[PDB]
Amino acid sequence: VDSRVDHLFPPSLYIFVIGVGLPTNCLALWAAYRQVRQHNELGVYLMNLSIADLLYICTLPLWVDYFLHHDNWIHGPGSCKLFGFIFYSNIYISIAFLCCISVDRYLAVAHPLRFARLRRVKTAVAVSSVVWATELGANSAPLFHDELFRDRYNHTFCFEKFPMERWVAWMNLYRVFVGFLFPWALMLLCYRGILRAVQSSVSTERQEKVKIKRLALSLIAIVLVCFAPYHALLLSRSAVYLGRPWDCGFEERVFSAYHSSLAFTSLNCVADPILYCLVNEGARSDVAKALHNL
């Protein structure tokens, strides 16, 4: 059980995320609020996604240090328990609001004349509240554990043990399977249904159909390219532990790749503002008309 020279990639990537995803997410939050003012209940989910992204990107300045300084956390146990819970959530909050958006879009497009009670700002707010309550209470296990752990080779950990606790493996399994694949599968099914509905449209001009398909494929490709490697490797180093709990052969080799993938999973915070409030000409219109106020 040891570590590698992983001190440049996650820091240089979180710096880019800080530089791009604070202004883009503030603009996206403003545009989503603009949408809510018009009783577009998609705006509620867009605001919630922007909030999760914002309070994720506002807790990176700590892990950029935690990775610059080699793998040690020094801001007490209190910061490592709050900023470590915000950092290992908001992934399952972002990919829950993306699923909420895809289901909202599927209902509007594939059933345009039904379920009108489900498409309202009130029900959107209630669903957002339930989404925040779950995945923040059901992912709250790391709080009720000591989680600023030291070891031999001067590695002050934060939310880890390479010798994994009994719960950590099961909670990782839950992460991979009921925080990523389930919401991602629902996103994929919703966009497949949206494309099947758009296909039948008589009034859409077959280049708009191509634009819709190439946006719907990128929506479910960005999520996979950002979350699949980290979660597959988390599955790997959690499945090995059940086979050989008292072993460290795999972990030392896979440590650097694991932390680089964890750095990668942060690109789905500058991905969201673009793909959901900056790729269409209506929300860019809001950006243009509001930045022209000052």
8 A C-beta contact, residue 87 and residue 75: no
The pair of structure tokens assigned to 86 is 């915000």
Task: Output DSSP code: residue 143.
Answer: G
| Stated resolution in angstroms | 2.6
Burial class (CB in 10 A: 0-12, 13-18, 19+), 288: exposed
Q: What angle do CA 267, 148, 159 make, to 5 degrees?
A: 35
> Cα(72)–Cα(149) distance, rounded to whole angstroms?
10
> Cα(105)–Cα(97) distance, rounded to whole angstroms?
12
Which residues, in sequence order, are CB contacts of 184 under 8 Å at separation 6+?
95, 99, 220, 223, 224, 227
Other beta carbons within 10 Å of 108? 17
The pair of structure tokens assigned to 237 is 């180093």
Other beta carbons within 10 Å of 202? 4
Domain boundaries, the chain: 9-291
Experimental method: cryo-EM
> Which alpha helices (DSSP H) does the chain contain, by range?
9-37, 42-57, 60-68, 76-87, 91-110, 121-133, 166-175, 181-200, 208-243, 249-264, 271-277, 281-291
> Cα(28)–Cα(43) distance, rounded to whole angstroms?
10
Cα separation values, 111 from 42, 71, 126, Å: 16, 51, 21
Which is nearest to 57 in space by CA: 95, 7, 22? Answer: 22
- φ/ψ region of 6 (left if φ > 0, alpha if ψ in -120 to 50, else beta) reads beta
- φ/ψ region of 159 (left if φ > 0, alpha if ψ in -120 to 50, else beta) reads left
Domain 9-291 CATH superfamily: Rhodopsin 7-helix transmembrane proteins (1.20.1070.10)
> Cα(150)–Cα(256) distance, rounded to whole angstroms?
18
Task: Output DSSP code: residue 79.
Answer: H
